[PDB]
């Protein structure tokens, strides 16, 4: 059995993390090309950050008011712009160590992995999921802000996320690269209220399938169900609807196994309403959702 | 709370494909030495009962493909330590790091560098558990996978991945080819023990929920060792120590609850249970993170 959870290799957004320090604020930034990407919020004091206004701000910083530092290596910021939420800092240096990147806005449902860094120097690597209400749950202490996340596909890194607020209840919010917020959230210290926390329902159902080829069938039963009526019952257990969309890309598992959706759906229904009973599936006792769709698939 | 690994980078530049006849896995690329399990020499057929040292002394040094991406390395020497071929190429690896080979002792943590022929595909934070097993992702291919940890600058190597056992668990060595546990490198039976919980890493995970704000498990109540390791053994977990109680001392001050005192609490969720509740969002009790992580992620 086994589906651990594995985060993808850093090494190559290791070499871009940089520490900023505006004033006595410092915090994290991105080191690709010729600029560096930071949140704009660096340039603000803990009283401005109650009602900040970004364009007084900065329209009183100079280049020099900025200082940027890869390791011991100082780099000159030579102009500075800002785009939405975040600050792009022009340096006279390229990076040497700049991969073949993209930047990606994800979707509620998708996973990246999260180097967390301290003061321009990465401490830790771990998974995770986007949640339905637009937060992540990960571990991050008073330093982690301008954090990054990311996909690996074909040495092209995909920046998908940047750490800038931590939310009152433990999560985190954050922007793309673009520095638009991923959810109704604002760089202010106001009081934001993160919506309900659901399940990933269409993440469930292909990690269940995911057990069927692996062996585990202890779940199935004979019945099936309307998309409709599973929807009505899976409310009920904080579970997110299921659209058509969802059940086309499960598609291919269901091809590879003889179990269609709604019959998935069904055995669901039944885990949600009985338990585990003690039991495992691929060696979790719980229902995990975050592994989406398109990573069963590949490993089959 | 979540479950860090460290970051790979160091070790990402040291992972090379060693090929001999049809085999293919990987190896670590340090200095001048190229380090992979010795089965690698082995047919299927061989695999049965091997002479390791018959199987060498026929090898010859064109018998091995070393490749570090695009660029071939060429063996000019062969040895076995143990469990493990080193291989002596032409070329030394610039992107050597600081690095040290240790031993480590079941309970304690790493993180493990999963490859598929050469390449890195994935990084994740386990324990050796008290059977001397991994739990992990391995698939096929990814023979010669390192576990590793990083202190400062220095990169602690102290397991490299050799076998798969049929429970989904894994098995391996140290980087001197010496096995952790009863494992043998041969294609025959072979069983792994009674896992039992790491006890001192539970405790040291209740003492984060507190530092976290979760107190709800804390009790007025204490107990003393011997008492406790009666229903621990009962529930099959690892006796405790005293110094593992001296190792908790840390996170004893920043809480304010003792070893024992907190012992109490432990105790009564493994007999009445969590009572239908939930410690830092699980409904199980964690056992792979040790007290020196819980300090590192937290104080």
């Given at each position: 059995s086994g589906f651990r959870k594995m985060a993808f290799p850093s090494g190559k957004?290791?070499?871009?993390?940089?520490?900023?320090?505006?004033?006595?604020?410092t915090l994290n930034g991105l080191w690709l090309d010729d600029?560096?990407?930071?949140?704009?919020?660096?340039?603000?004091?803990?009283?401005?950050?109650?009602?900040?206004?970004?364009?007084?701000?900065?329209?009183?910083?100079?280049?020099?008011?900025?200082?940027?530092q890869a390791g011991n290596?100082?780099?000159?910021?030579?102009?500075?712009?800002?785009?939405?939420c975040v600050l792009k800092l022009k340096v006279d240096t390229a990076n040497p160590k700049t991969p073949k990147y993209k930047f990606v806005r994800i979707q509620p449902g998708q996973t990246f992995s999260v180097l967390?860094?301290?003061?321009?120097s990465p401490s830790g690597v771990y998974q995770c999921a986007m949640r339905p209400n637009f937060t992540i749950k990960g571990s991050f202490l008073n330093g982690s802000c301008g954090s990054v996340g990311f996909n690996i596909d074909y040495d092209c890194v995909?920046?998908?996320?940047?750490?800038?607020?931590?939310?009152?209840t433990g999560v985190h919010a954050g922007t793309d690269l673009e520095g638009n917020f991923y959810g109704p959230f604002?760089?202010?210290?106001?009081?934001?209220?993160?919506?309900?926390?659901?399940?990933?329902?269409?993440?469930?159902?292909?990690?269940l399938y995911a057990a069927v080829i692996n062996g585990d069938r202890w779940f199935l039963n004979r019945f099936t169900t309307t998309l409709n009526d599973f929807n009505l019952v899976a409310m009920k257990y904080n579970?997110?609807?299921?659209?058509?969309?969802?059940?086309?890309?499960?598609?291919?598992?269901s091809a590879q196994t003889g179990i269609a959706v709604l019959d998935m759906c069904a055995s669901l229904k039944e885990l949600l309403q009985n338990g585990?009973?003690?039991?495992?599936?691929?060696?979790?006792?719980?229902?995990?959702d975050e592994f989406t769709p398109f990573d069963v698939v590949r490993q089959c």
């Open positions: 957004v290791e070499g871009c993390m940089v520490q900023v320090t505006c004033g006595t604020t600029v560096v990407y930071c949140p704009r919020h660096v340039i603000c004091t803990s009283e401005d950050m109650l009602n900040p206004n970004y364009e007084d701000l900065l329209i009183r910083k100079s280049n020099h008011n900025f200082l940027v290596v100082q780099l000159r910021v030579i102009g500075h712009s800002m785009q939405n967390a860094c301290y003061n321009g995909s920046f998908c996320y940047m750490h800038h607020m931590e939310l009152p604002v760089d202010r210290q106001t009081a934001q209220a993160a919506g309900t926390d659901t399940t990933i329902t269409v993440n469930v159902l292909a990690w579970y997110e609807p299921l659209t058509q969309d969802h059940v086309d890309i499960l598609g291919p598992l585990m009973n003690g039991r495992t599936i691929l060696g979790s006792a719980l229902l995990e």
